[PDB]
Design a protein around this ligand. Structure first.
Ligand code: PC1
Ligand code: NDP
Ligand code: SF4
Ligand code: SF4
Ligand code: SF4
Ligand code: SF4
Ligand code: SF4
Ligand code: K
Ligand code: ZN
Lengths: 115, 370, 176, 42, 45, 48, 155, 342, 209, 96, 291
């Protein structure tokens, strides 16, 4: 039933261990990417943007899924340091252009007839 | 569109990373939402060098699932245009290579010739390229009167046009030193890297789809493929040039004994009824009506059947859901297998000659990126 | 059957090495290239004098569309809707509601040129040869909006490229 | 029967965060599983 | 009835060249060097 | 078109235009269909 | 006259801007065939003063040819910015100008004009070689319909 | 409202937003951004253009196909304005010359056209007008800028009773004509700053803030009549301003004062050129006077927008002016400036 | 051919690959769940996820198979089955001019040990499947995005990612770069519900449920 | 046959007419509206009505294969003279 | 079916007919399957369709000109296997391969007929009947089908207020909700009431009930009247058709009191039609005699 094959994790411990130095690699990644890619957003801005993206993937409770997020997570940092990505790619997570989607009931009610 | 990112140990290169994807259109994804007839021009847009040959692969593939064979006449036209694409492709292949090196004149003599067969495509289908001529069941329209004579006149003069392409490149010591002893691929590495077509032919390996598993009507025709000794970019260049000479005879053999008969299979459930038949026969209207709304329903199954496209082993792997629409058609391309070994291919050589390796690899960003 | 290409076994005799040494020392294959190119120079070119003359085409040529009409002027289109049922790029949009004389013919026939593929499936799909691929191709415009065709634009081109299209379809209906 | 550092998770399988769908397209959606109703004409 | 589809002539189309026709134009290696040296001696004289 | 002209019909254009792009007689795209729904017209009664 | 001198100078300034403009490519897809298949002897363009040349710093008009994927979108924008002024872009092919076949797919922007300010649109899938040659001719005629020095003098 | 004008769509490019703008003279610094902030949610912008079409090329991308309809117009041709604002729900006036030209003196550019377009638009039954004027519109200022700015302001306010006059302080941005001006002194003698610039503690506004402010003014129902006053987030003095920008741009800073009438000759020399006058004796007075504080007029934050800081979103233009020396240098390297923030 | 409409069928090829299917079945019956010949004379091998390396190595070096030409590797993602991703290889043998299809099954989470040891051709036939579908192959040299935009999310060729995707590009003046945004279509891709309500083939009829 | 709108916009056969308040009419200003003057609605009002005589007429559309899929039209409703749906050509019986 | 015809003779042609502004008759397409006749005289209960003549030129028509009156006439469209009988309003408006079908219900009648809504380009073209047996079964009454154009008639699409003179002028939401809010917080109890309409959603009914109660008021009236006295709405069986029309066939004698179901609940009568035809129901109604 619950028998599934691993890729990198058995227990949440080592699963949370992988996201630890994944943060560590990403934590030290911010100071170089902002300067080398010539942005405008601040260093701590990037650091918290890395931070928050962790919190989005926090409600999952399966060692089986987190590592899939880890490999997806580790599938991006090298794309930044080795100048593979571009300014439109790494500032994209800095969601800037789009207008702010209304959150309260009235403002959604006013904008359109959609949920 | 090529994003080659690669390392310079001084002037010497140790690993080349060809970041393909710059032209990636998810062709198979759109194919999932079109009928077989609608999905056909996608293959026509896959290898926009030897376009009609891509129709050949898709056609016999759908013929194989449908258990319907093309009429004998239509079989012979397809190989005529199939080899014209071979003439189309190798002319582009040798010259773009020569264009990459720095040879300009071979590019324009051969590209002067390219108009003649593009003009032939105009007379037979109605477009310079992307003919959409070869369809499941044979070919859409019949050959216009006098076209066979016209291609005969072009073919009877084309062997002359090859000579200069050979004369000032094959003998030119400049072309040799800029094309020999580069992109050398050993036989087993070529085979096990998934390479197809000329890389197999160039590296000494005796193998060709058109002869080992002769599809269509290639049975009756007779010729000889040019397997060489070394397999470097120069050797493949002779294989390319000799293939145009070989394609000339293949054109000759189908030309002189073109059989009489229909252009499309006499199966209205798979081939649209004739326009004259459309406006007189009640079944013709019904069959034509539904064929252009949903099309023929293909029985379930899956095939990969491939043809010897001038790029190499080109095949399509479609799965049928038992309806009038494909489920998934993996676009197997020689170029993706061709380029898969680029890391080794540029190994041991510098920039100015691995660009020659790019030329001999016959990479075109419609087969890989789709 | 197959034939080799590279292998040559160049003979190492005194006469043969002289030719190879002469070829290297006093270049001969290179001067061959000069001779071939010069022979190319003394040959009249193949260039065409556009627009004063334009290259050949075929009766089957597929170009800018046009909605044709009967001998008396009736729209051939009946909104059977086969054309967009086979339009590979879904460039055709059609709506039909009643026409004054009891009829319920079409109102909307917009083939987006920037979506169309010019495959010619529409003209083959049409059972009344209403939509056709015209011979014209010189309709380049500087606005994206111009290429977005409508019903009136299609009908006007049908009245513009009419005699030519009628002759082509008369010279091609036996093939189709 | 088989074991290679076997993983045993009781949590209901959920890709969600890995399939890449956006939040408003995972929370504010409605999916009605049913059998297609045949067209009464046919 | 009658059928007038495109067809080859009532025999066959004329035979078409299929091999390489690279010609051999020039003098022997001895002749090339001899005329070159002969000019040099002429020029020196 | 000499020798034998093509066929003659009423609806063929009396003269062939040129490419009208970039000129005041350009082509403009517009919706050829009719407005599907119509609003509820409010009566202008004096009131109440 | 004051208007006459600026009229003669304006013509001289742009008389050969429509005859010495040199095309630039990116050559994405099957439209990249007619890109230089026109450079082939048949539909000679070198005679028209135009001649293909990449040299993004030293070219006049770029003929955007092929399908514009999102992945390449930075590359075109950086090329057009590096493009010197005056600059024009020509959208060859249905895919380039309006997406064409793949308009509904996920990895192509629907038309090039969504990315670059797009001049004369030449349609075709692909545009048969002379159709762009006609399109290039329209671009040169558009160059004549310019009042650069006239507008400056009016201000 | 009109059936076609009702807004639909999830605020997208093809979403009918109802706004039908007619931004006048949008081929300018603010026009590009406001059009972008107009075409982003699908507003049918009918921009009148008077220059070469090529100069309007950069405006086509910021909008769905067929949304940005370019039309020609003339200041002296009344029919030109009447056409452009004919089928216009809203009118946005932005025309203004920052220098003096022969065909248009400074009187008309803020009296003739702004009054004429406001009058005809009311005569054409438009529903709004957002004509803008500098916060320092001052008929008492000897500079012909601020005189004509408020001289004609009464006409547009009167002829259009509900005219939402806009009063921005200092619109700094990419092509702001001030930040780029201050670096141009590198080839005009080392920083000739009058009185070492001790006169202009100022609050400049970023373009996104003001341009966003405009698009709210169209959709904000209260915008009618009430004149808003767009301000910065932070008061900064010239010697503080120029030192800061010369520090972020890393250009050598050598401020140097001189008599005011010397700049009158400097202004005169730059205006004499038969082309774009690099320096006008008008604007030096404008930069000389500080940010006049008008507290009665509602500010930027009233509409519902926070004013982005100067030091934050400024590197964009300063980076362009850096030489190869410290071009790649980042933003936090530089020291922020002395915030007086009155 | 007395029936030129139909495709003529061959039986000497039919039984021979049928016999070879048994041959491979006996040699290693640990992984082959079942073998299916085709009317198209394309015999197919159905293997287990752990069986990828054994069979692929077996057909590579065996003296009676010699299948060493990797044709393609792809997925046939089928939502209705618990193993949605159906990984299938195609092999070609020059010596005996035959084509072998080996088919596996996998969930979104289960991995497959990389076949780069068998064929280095898979090196790039592995990357796109991880990108296009999302299934991850273990012990592979690199799992990079090869056929998508940089930073692209999800997996397109799945039966979950819509045709138009979720994100659209456009060049914006304020940022001076081509930025992204949620997709918006001028035209919605219309639906063509074209599957007939009449049964097509009695032969391939699904067994009653 | 074409009728002119109050604003001068020539209406098409479908009946489309941009009113005064339709803001999108600005697309038409400084340009020209494209109307096919030949109005296919009224090109059959004047077309002669065939007096071919039989209970059923084979209407092929003229030009043989260049017309429309030929249909059989029944002439038994003397009130309504038969019209080919494809063609619109008008056929009547010689008073039965 | 074949792929061609050996037919080289002529085809018979028959004139059209006019039996309704909804059904459209192209009777040359008729295949004489007699489905309409058996439907008319067994399901709709009207004995007017028939096949006049014999041989091969016979027509499935009505001989004497007729005006098809049955309220189940719309289902005659969905039973004919050819285009011989077709819906006039939907004719030449859409084709099947583009109409996205959504399964929904009917609100015209108090049966909640399971229907298929054809949608294309933000609008509905034609309404089809679904299947659930107890509900509409395989047929729907006419006004259930030919009602899509009603959604294209007078439509309330914007908020409304009385302007300075009163005249109904279109306004934003803010003024509309502000106007109601001012008079909503004021007044209490029986001052604030509610009258339920015909086509009111259960979601809205709850919302009004909660809203009226949160301002301490219970006056949520309804259009039709049902005596509250005795038990009223308290007992569920008072206001329910507890017999589950799918069970009417099981019954033997039907007693209909003060109703005209052929005009009020056509499908409920259609069940009796089917049930009484096969199960031999004994019907008895007091009131005005209507067919
Ligand atoms: C009016 C204009 C008239 C002149 C036009 C240009 C003439 C020169 C170029 C073309 C000459 C003919 C080329 C030709 O025959 O090529 C094939 C021939 C034969 O080529 P081949 O390679 O077949 O020669 C075979 C014989 N062996 C192997 C021994 C070489 O080319 C030659 O003979 C080239 C000889 C070049 C000699 C160069 C060195 C001396 C230069 C002296 C100063 C000048
Ligand atoms: N700190 C500041 O400087 C502030 C300035 N403002 C106001 O902003 C306005 C300018 O903004 P912006 O548009 O970005 O400035 P730009 O100088 O960048 O552009 C000015 C525009 O005005 C047009 N124009 C000028 N004169 C005429 C004329 N006679 N006929 C037609 N068009 C004309 C120009 O046309 P063309 O491009 O062909 O020259 C151009 O489109 C001025 O009114 C200014 O006072 C508001 C707040 C603060
Ligand atoms: S053009 Fe032809 S196929 Fe298309 S709707 Fe009109 S009649 Fe039907
Ligand atoms: S030619 Fe164009 S309009 Fe016609 S079917 Fe092909 S893509 Fe559609
Ligand atoms: S327009 Fe046609 S030829 Fe050009 S890139 Fe698109 S599909 Fe290819
Ligand atoms: S249901 Fe239709 S086809 Fe059948 S008899 Fe009646 S009219 Fe004829
Ligand atoms: S769709 Fe059916 S009913 Fe209509 S004409 Fe064709 S075959 Fe006859
Ligand atoms: K029917
Ligand atoms: Zn007819």
């Amino acid at each position: 039933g619950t028998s599934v094959k691993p890729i990198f994790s058995r227990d949440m411990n080592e699963a949370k261990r992988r996201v630890r130095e994944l943060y560590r690699a990403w934590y030290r990644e911010v100071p170089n990417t902002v300067h080398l890619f010539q942005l405008d957003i601040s260093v701590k801005q990037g650091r918290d943007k890395v931070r928050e993206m962790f919190m989005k993937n926090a409600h999952v409770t399966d060692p089986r899924v987190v590592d899939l997020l880890v490999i997806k997570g580790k599938m991006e940092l090298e794309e930044t340091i080795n100048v593979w990505k571009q300014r439109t790619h790494i500032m994209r997570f800095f969601h800037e252009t789009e207008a702010p989607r209304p959150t309260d009931f009235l403002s959604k009610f006013y904008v359109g007839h959609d949920p | 569109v090529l994003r080659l990112v690669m390392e310079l140990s001084g002037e010497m290169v140790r690993k080349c990373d060809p970041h393909i994807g710059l032209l990636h259109r998810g062709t198979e994804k759109l194919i999932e939402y079109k009928t077989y007839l609608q999905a056909l021009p996608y293959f026509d847009r896959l290898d926009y060098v030897s376009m009609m040959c891509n129709e050949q692969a898709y056609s016999l593939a759908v013929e194989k699932l449908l258990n319907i064979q093309p009429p004998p006449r239509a079989q012979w036209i397809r190989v005529l245009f199939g080899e014209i694409t071979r003439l189309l492709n190798h002319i582009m292949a040798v010259t773009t290579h020569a264009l990459d090196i720095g040879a300009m004149t071979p590019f324009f003599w051969m590209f002067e010739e390219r108009e003649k067969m593009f003009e032939f495509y105009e007379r037979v289908s109605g477009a310079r390229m992307h003919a959409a001529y070869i369809r499941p069941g044979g070919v859409h329209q019949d050959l216009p009167l006098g076209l066979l004579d016209d291609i005969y006149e072009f073919s009877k003069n084309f062997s002359f046009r090859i000579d200069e392409l050979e004369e000032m490149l094959t003998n030119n010591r400049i072309w040799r030193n800029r094309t020999v002893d580069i992109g050398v691929v050993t036989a087993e590495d070529a085979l096990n890297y998934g390479f197809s077509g000329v890389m197999l032919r160039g590296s000494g390996i005796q193998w060709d789809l058109r002869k080992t598993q002769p599809y269509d009507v290639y049975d009756q025709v007779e010729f000889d493929v040019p397997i060489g000794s070394r397999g470097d970019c120069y050797d493949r260049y002779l294989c390319r040039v000799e293939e145009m000479r070989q394609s000339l005879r293949i054109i000759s053999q189908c030309l002189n004994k073109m059989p009489p008969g229909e252009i499309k299979v006499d199966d209205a459930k798979v081939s649209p009824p004739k326009r004259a038949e459309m406006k007189t026969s009640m079944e013709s209207l019904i069959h034509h009506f539904k064929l252009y709304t949903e099309g023929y329903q293909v029985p379930p199954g899956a095939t990969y059947t491939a043809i010897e496209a001038p790029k190499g082993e080109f095949g399509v792997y479609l799965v049928s859901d038992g309806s009038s629409r494909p489920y998934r058609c993996k676009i197997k391309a020689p170029g993706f297998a061709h380029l898969a070994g680029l890391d080794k291919m540029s190994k041991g050589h510098m920039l100015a000659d691995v660009v020659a390796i790019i030329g001999t690899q016959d990479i075109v960003f419609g087969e890989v990126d789709r | 059957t197959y034939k080799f290409v590279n292998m040559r076994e160049p003979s190492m005799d005194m006469k043969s090495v002289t030719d190879r040494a002469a070829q290297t020392l006093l270049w001969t294959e290179l001067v061959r290239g000069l001779g071939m190119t010069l022979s190319y120079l003394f040959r009249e070119p193949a260039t065409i004098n556009y627009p004063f003359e334009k290259g050949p085409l075929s009766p089957r040529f597929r170009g800018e569309h046009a909605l044709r009409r009967y001998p008396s002027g009736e729209e051939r289109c009946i909104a059977c809707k086969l054309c967009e049922a086979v339009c590979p790029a879904q460039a055709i949009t059609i709506e039909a509601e009643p026409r004054a004389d009891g009829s319920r013919r079409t109102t909307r026939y917009d083939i987006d040129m920037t979506k169309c593929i010019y495959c010619g499936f529409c003209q083959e799909a049409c059972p009344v040869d209403a939509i056709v691929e015209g011979p014209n191709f010189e309709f380049s415009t500087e606005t994206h909006e111009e290429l977005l065709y409508n019903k009136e634009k299609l009908l006007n081109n049908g009245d513009k490229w009419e005699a030519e299209i009628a002759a082509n379809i008369q010279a091609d209906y036996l093939y189709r | 029967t088989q074991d290679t550092q076997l993983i045993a998770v009781d949590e209901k399988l959920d890709i969600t965060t890995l399939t890449g769908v956006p939040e408003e397209h995972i929370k504010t959606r409605k999916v009605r599983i049913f059998v297609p109703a045949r067209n009464n004409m046919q | 009835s009658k059928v007038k589809q495109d067809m080859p002539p009532p025999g066959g189309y004329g035979p078409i060249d299929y091999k390489r026709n690279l010609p051999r134009r020039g003098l022997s290696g001895y002749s090339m060097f001899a005329v070159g040296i002969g000019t040099l001696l002429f020029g020196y004289w | 078109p000499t020798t034998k002209p093509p066929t003659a019909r009423k609806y063929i254009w009396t003269n062939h235009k040129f490419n009208v792009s970039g000129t005041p007689q350009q082509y403009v795209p517009y919706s050829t269909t009719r407005k599907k729904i119509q609003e509820w017209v409010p009566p202008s009664t004096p009131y109440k | 006259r004051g208007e006459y001198v600026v009229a003669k100078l304006d013509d001289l300034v742009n008389w050969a801007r429509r005859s010495s403009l040199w095309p630039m490519t990116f050559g994405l897809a099957c439209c990249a065939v007619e890109m230089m298949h026109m450079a082939a002897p048949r539909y000679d363009m070198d005679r028209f003063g135009v001649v293909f040349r990449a040299s993004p710093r030293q070219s006049d008009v770029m003929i955007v040819a092929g399908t514009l994927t999102n992945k390449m979108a930075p590359a075109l924008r950086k090329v057009y910015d590096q493009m010197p002024e005056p600059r024009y872009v020509v959208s060859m092919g249905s895919c380039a100008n309006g997406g064409g076949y793949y308009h509904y797919s996920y990895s192509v922007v629907r038309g090039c004009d969504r990315i670059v300010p797009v001049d004369i649109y030449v349609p075709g899938c692909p545009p048969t070689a002379e159709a762009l040659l006609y399109g290039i001719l329209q671009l040169q005629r558009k160059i004549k319909r310019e009042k650069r020095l006239r507008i400056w003098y009016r201000r | 409202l009109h059936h076609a004008l009702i807004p639909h769509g999830k605020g997208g490019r093809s979403s009918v937003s109802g706004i039908v703008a007619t931004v006048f003279g949008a081929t300018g610094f603010l026009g590009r951004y406001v059009v972008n902030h107009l075409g982003r949610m699908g507003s049918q912008v009918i921009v009148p253009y008077r220059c070469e079409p090529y100069d309007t090329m950069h405006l086509r991308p910021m909008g769905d196909l067929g949304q940005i309809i370019f039309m020609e117009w003339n200041g002296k041709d009344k029919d030109s304005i009447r056409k452009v604002v004919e089928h216009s729900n809203v009118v946005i006036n932005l025309v203004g010359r920052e220098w003096e030209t022969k065909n248009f003196d400074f009187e008309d550019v803020f009296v003739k056209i702004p009054h004429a377009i406001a009058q005809v638009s009311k005569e054409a039954g438009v529903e709004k007008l957002i004509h803008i004027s500098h916060l320092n519109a001052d008929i008492k200022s000897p500079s012909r800028y601020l005189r004509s700015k408020a001289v004609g302001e009464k006409e547009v306010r009167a002829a259009f009773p509900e005219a939402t006059i806009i009063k921005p302080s200092d619109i700094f941005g990419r092509e702001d004509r001030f930040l780029n001006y201050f670096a141009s002194m590198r080839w005009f003698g080392g920083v000739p700053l009058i009185s070492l610039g001790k006169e202009t503690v100022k609050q400049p506004v970023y373009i996104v803030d003001v341009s966003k402010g405009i698009i709210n003014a169209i959709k904000d129902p209260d915008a009618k009549g009430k004149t808003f006053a767009f301000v910065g987030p932070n008061r900064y003095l010239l010697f503080d301003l120029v030192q800061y920008i010369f520090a972020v741009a890393y250009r050598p800073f050598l401020p140097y004062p001189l008599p005011h009438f010397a700049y009158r000759w400097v202004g005169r020399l730059f205006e004499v050129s038969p082309f774009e006058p690099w320096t006008t004796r008008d604007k030096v007075e404008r930069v000389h006077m500080s940010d006049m504080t008008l507290p009665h007029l509602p500010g930027l934050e009233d509409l519902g927008i926070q004013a982005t800081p100067l030091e934050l979103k400024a590197i964009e233009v300063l980076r362009r002016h850096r030489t190869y020396r410290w071009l790649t240098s980042e933003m936090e390297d530089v020291k922020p400036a002395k915030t007086v923030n009155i | 051919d007395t029936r030129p409409t139909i495709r003529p069928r061959n039986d000497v090829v039919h039984k021979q690959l049928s016999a070879f299917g048994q041959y491979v079945a006996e040699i290693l019956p640990k992984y082959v769940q079942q073998v299916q010949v085709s009317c198209f004379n394309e015999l197919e091998i159905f293997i287990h996820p752990d069986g990828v390396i054994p069979v692929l190595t077996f057909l590579r070096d065996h003296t009676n198979a010699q299948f060493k030409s990797l044709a393609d590797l792809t997925a046939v993602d089928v939502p209705t089955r618990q193993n949605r991703f159906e990984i299938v290889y195609n092999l070609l043998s020059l010596r005996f001019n035959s084509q072998i299809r080996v088919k596996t099954y996998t969930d979104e989470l289960t991995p497959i040990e990389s076949s780069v040891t068998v064929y280095k051709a898979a090196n790039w036939y592995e990357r796109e499947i991880w990108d296009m579908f999302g299934v991850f192959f273990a012990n592979h040299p690199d799992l990079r995005r090869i056929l998508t935009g940089y930073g692209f999310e999800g997996h397109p060729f799945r039966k979950d990612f819509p045709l138009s995707g979720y994100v659209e590009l456009r060049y914006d003046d304020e940022v001076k770069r081509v930025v992204a945004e949620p997709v918006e279509l001028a035209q919605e891709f219309r639906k063509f519900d074209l599957n007939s309500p009449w049964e097509a083939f009695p032969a391939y009829r699904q067994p009653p449920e | 046959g074409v009728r002119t709108s109050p604003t001068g916009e020539k209406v098409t056969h479908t009946g489309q007419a941009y009113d005064d308040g339709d803001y999108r009419r600005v697309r038409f200003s400084d340009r020209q509206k494209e109307v096919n003057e030949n109005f296919a609605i009224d090109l059959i009002a004047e077309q002669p009505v065939s007096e071919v005589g039989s209970r059923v007429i084979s209407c092929d559309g003229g030009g043989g294969a260049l017309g429309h899929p030929r249909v059989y039209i029944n002439l038994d409703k003397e009130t309504k003279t038969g019209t080919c749906g494809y063609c619109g050509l008008q056929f009547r019986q010689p008073h039965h | 079916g074949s792929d061609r015809s050996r037919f080289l003779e002529g085809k018979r042609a028959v004139e059209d007919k006019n039996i309704g502004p909804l059904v459209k008759t192209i009777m040359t397409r008729c295949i004489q399957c007699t489905r309409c006749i058996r439907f008319a005289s067994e399901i709709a209960g009207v004995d007017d369709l028939g096949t006049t003549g014999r041989g091969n030129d016979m027509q499935v028509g009505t001989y004497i000109e007729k005006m098809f009156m049955s309220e189940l006439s719309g289902n005659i469209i969905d039973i004919c296997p050819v285009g011989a009988l077709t819906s006039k309003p939907y004719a030449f408006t859409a084709r099947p391969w583009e109409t996205r079908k959504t399964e929904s219900i009917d609100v015209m009648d108090a049966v909640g007929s399971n229907i298929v809504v054809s949608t294309r380009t933000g609008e509905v073209m034609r309404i089809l009947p679904r299947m659930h047996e107890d509900i509409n079964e395989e047929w729907i009454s006419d006004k259930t089908r030919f009602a899509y154009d009603g959604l294209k008639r007078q439509r309330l699409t914007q908020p409304m207020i009385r302007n300075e003179k009163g005249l109904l002028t279109y306004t934003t939401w803010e003024d509309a909700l502000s106007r109601v809010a001012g008079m909503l917080q004021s007044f209490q109890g029986n001052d604030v009431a509610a009258i339920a309409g015909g086509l009111v959603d259960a979601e809205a009914l709850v919302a009004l009930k909660d809203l009226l109660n949160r301002v301490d008021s219970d006056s949520l009236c309804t259009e039709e009247v049902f005596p509250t006295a005795g038990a009223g709405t308290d007992l569920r069986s008072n206001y329910l058709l507890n017999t589950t029309i799918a069970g009417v066939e099981e019954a033997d004698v039907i007693l209909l009191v003060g109703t005209n179901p052929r005009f009020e609940a056509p499908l409920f009568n259609a069940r009796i039609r089917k049930s009484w035809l096969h199960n031999d129901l004994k019907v008895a109604l007091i009131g005005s005699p209507v067919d």
